Amino acid sequence: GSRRYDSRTTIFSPEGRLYQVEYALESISHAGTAIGIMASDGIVLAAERKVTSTLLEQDTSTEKLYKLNDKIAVAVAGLTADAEILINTARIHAQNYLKTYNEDIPVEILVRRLSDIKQGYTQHGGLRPFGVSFIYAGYDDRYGYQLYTSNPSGNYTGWKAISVGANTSAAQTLLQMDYKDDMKVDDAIELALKTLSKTTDSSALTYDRLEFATIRKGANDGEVYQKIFKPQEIKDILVKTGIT
């Protein structure tokens, strides 16, 4: 019968590893680098677009940074198509929680459920896992500003600063070097860009090859604002830190 053609996506190696999870992570390691840095007064999300073409429409484009609700955003590393399936699920899960409890979903609860979905694809169903790693940047009234990451294994962890995709080894060393706890958002913006600028496989880091977002309490009195940076705003912040 069909047994002949089954890849057996949800099995263990003799060493006790999940083949497909390991190979999905190998896929993600080639994806454009995405950095998340958590400050005391906000969070930065920076992501490098995959080798841009000059005729790509930059302003009306979304590849790396996606909005889940008004308080939570994600940076993507891997298959965009796979990420969008999981994002629409995450967006619905957030609205289900709001409908049920009349309260915005706590960041960790959203992260756990999305991570539990990925876990399922590694343990049952005989389907390939999602070739996606997320950086979750969000705020709630319990833990305040939070950075998480999830990977195809369905394992998630919390971070002060973290990178996913390409050159994470090099990127994580540079963040571990210059990061400190009393750091402000404007400082974290500079660190995020400086890290990409050094780890980039490109010749020079330009506005047209970046997606940028901040989650500040920089609105008016005790409320959070999500800022998905426009092309011209990335061009200005890149000049202001003296990279171009």
Partner: protein, 204 residues
């Protein structure tokens, strides 16, 4: 045991010159017993306003349901929903429950952010759209509101004048209904400012 007249309540919407007004009473009762004088029946999703009369459990449920849907709409469309579009969403959602309906009388009110045109619409519990230039009425004193609005209303009223007309339409209609009144709220909606006024009315 008539779901539309257990809790009671009323909503009315009107159009003016480059403005719209939507008003509701504050009563929630269990037939004869008045229970709450703080039960607002007007909600908003961005700049689109929705008033809902009828069974209070379904009013609350539909508010929560349209908040859910307009939030996903905004995330995917990357823009706030417009009154004309929202009206169609309400109609779809209600008719989806054709043979087990929400016992409600919803009323859409708002200004199209692109065209600047004032827009109002009403629905039956099963989703039939009632678009109108002048006014929409809903609730246990709909007959009273129809009689007030049809006589008091004139076109192209200024926001300050329109406020008086809608306020008097609601108050005098509510005082001839046992299940309506116990306080009132009026939303005056201009292109980029919204004023909300609580009316002083008789508390019987």
């Amino acid at each position: 045991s008539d779901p539309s007249s257990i809790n009671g309540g009323i909503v009315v919407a009107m159009t003016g010159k480059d403005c719209v007004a939507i008003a509701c009473d504050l009563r929630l009762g269990s037939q004869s017993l008045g229970v709450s004088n703080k039960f607002e029946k007007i909600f908003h999703y961005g700049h689109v306003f929705l008033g809902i009369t009828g069974l209070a459990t379904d009013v609350t449920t539909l508010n929560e349901m349209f908040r859910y849907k307009t939030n996903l709409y905004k995330l995917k469309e990357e823009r706030a929903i417009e009154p004309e579009t929202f009206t169609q969403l309400v109609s779809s959602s209600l008719y989806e429950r054709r043979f087990g309906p929400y016992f409600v009388g919803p009323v859409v009110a708002g200004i199209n952010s692109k065209s600047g045109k004032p827009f109002i619409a009403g629905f039956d519990l099963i989703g039939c759209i009632d678009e109108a230039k002048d006014f929409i009425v809903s609730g246990t004193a709909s007959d009273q509101l129809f009689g007030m609005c049809e006589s008091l209303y004139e076109p192209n009223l200024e926001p300050e004048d329109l406020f008086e007309t809608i306020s008097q339409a609601l108050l005098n209609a509510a005082d001839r209904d046992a299940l309506s009144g116990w306080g009132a709220v009026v939303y005056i909606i201009k292109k980029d400012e919204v004023v909300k006024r609580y009316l002083k009315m008789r508390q019987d």
